[PDB]
């Protein structure tokens, strides 16, 4: 799924499929604005 | 013993870096950004 350029961001917060090892990983899905894609990040208050 | 306890505990110190554990600055950050992070944790733990 990471082997694709149909997507746009792949921003994780390479080394970011090396850190994907934790508890139950979610798939929180939602429709944003292009001004709200910028605010899907840790923080963004 | 008190000299050892000081010497042990300062491994946990951030020294102004992101983490005080090398396996999270390396396995999460990019290798250009991992260099400066692993730079400072060497210098910080050296002067301990």
Swiss-Prot record, chain B:
It comes from the Viruses. Residues 1-38 form a coiled coil. Acts as a viral fusion peptide which is unmasked following S2 cleavage occurring upon virus endocytosis. This is Spike protein S2'. It comes from Severe acute respiratory syndrome coronavirus. The lineage of its organism: Viruses, Riboviria, Orthornavirae, Pisuviricota, Pisoniviricetes. The chain holds residues 938 to 985 of 1255 of the full protein.
